[PDB]
């Protein structure tokens, strides 16, 4: 049953959405798509509506649109962005050219929180608990966020948290250059392309975020990739032979070996006054060798979270088939796959 759609121009972009969505108001714009806040009269929810930008413009864009839609349709967890609705005004595959994604409206991110509020140790426990709870879920489906930073973590007035803006495409080189938050939370192996990276890249970002919640300050605010690596090695120590061997990039390996060796610092002397259990956890997250970092499931059982940990309420995700990542398809094939996923969507309760 096709709802009735209505048309409006919001910032020289035409929005064609079902009647249920009212009071559309531009809230953001990028190469990803334009975003509007709206009121969903059907559910009574304040929602964010994203209009994808030229979703089927190239093979790469079509595959990306399919990827984003597949990912959002899968994620069903309190601490992870989920999909309330997806629609298109198209009546057939032949006229299908726009995809609109509907989610909860977020308002505030953790960037806003860290800047404008005093976070007690109890707040840090709760906020980091939820991130790890969501990441246990995401990682259980072999999904890596890759881009966790405070601006990608929405927090409501009750300090309730959702993970959003999954890394879906390489940032440009320019975007990662210089004194920029876009790089400060990245694991060094991914920042410098040391090796085939894994899901603990996300645990590294959690360590950086947790530290910032505790001190109110960026942990590794490098002025460039190399300055940042130096900030990192100063804290955690220069790599040993065992990690060196795992750096498959001969060039990177040769560079790190040029550095004066440095021991890991005392974290109690960096995080002065912090809960000793918070310090212990940071030590387990901020490990250079990604093989040896604590995982999300392991971290949830750490004594730091004794107050919030409930092993019966830390769910894993349904299996997630990402074999499409391996296919080279034509635009029209990606578009048809995307169409199927739009028309098969079932809203949550
Ligand atoms: C991959 C992937 N990971 N997340 C997505 C995704 C998809 C759709 C939406 C709508 C969103 C999304 C959800 C919420 C918001 C949001 O509430 N933005 C915002 C920003 C600033 C102010 C206001 C307000 N009022 C609202 C923006 C975007 C994210 O895709």
PDB file of C-alpha atoms in Angstrom, residues 17 21 28 32 62 79 88 101 168 180 182 244-245 254 257 300 303 307 342:
ATOM      1  CA  UNK A  17       8.195  12.188   1.432  1.00  0.00           C
ATOM      2  CA  UNK A  21       6.376  13.001   8.000  1.00  0.00           C
ATOM      3  CA  UNK A  28      22.621  18.874   7.889  1.00  0.00           C
ATOM      4  CA  UNK A  32      26.586  11.631   2.002  1.00  0.00           C
ATOM      5  CA  UNK A  62      25.485   2.336  -6.098  1.00  0.00           C
ATOM      6  CA  UNK A  79      23.005   1.361  21.640  1.00  0.00           C
ATOM      7  CA  UNK A  88      11.337   6.091  -2.342  1.00  0.00           C
ATOM      8  CA  UNK A 101      16.450   6.792   5.255  1.00  0.00           C
ATOM      9  CA  UNK A 168      31.147   3.290   4.852  1.00  0.00           C
ATOM     10  CA  UNK A 180      41.824  17.206  12.877  1.00  0.00           C
ATOM     11  CA  UNK A 182      38.881  12.961  11.983  1.00  0.00           C
ATOM     12  CA  UNK A 244      57.237  -5.312  14.245  1.00  0.00           C
ATOM     13  CA  UNK A 245      57.024  -8.698  12.487  1.00  0.00           C
ATOM     14  CA  UNK A 254      61.458   0.402   8.575  1.00  0.00           C
ATOM     15  CA  UNK A 257      62.515   1.079  13.742  1.00  0.00           C
ATOM     16  CA  UNK A 300      31.917  -5.616  29.491  1.00  0.00           C
ATOM     17  CA  UNK A 303      35.211  -4.703  37.176  1.00  0.00           C
ATOM     18  CA  UNK A 307      27.316  -1.463  38.330  1.00  0.00           C
ATOM     19  CA  UNK A 342      13.658  -0.910   0.094  1.00  0.00           C
TER      20      UNK A 342
END
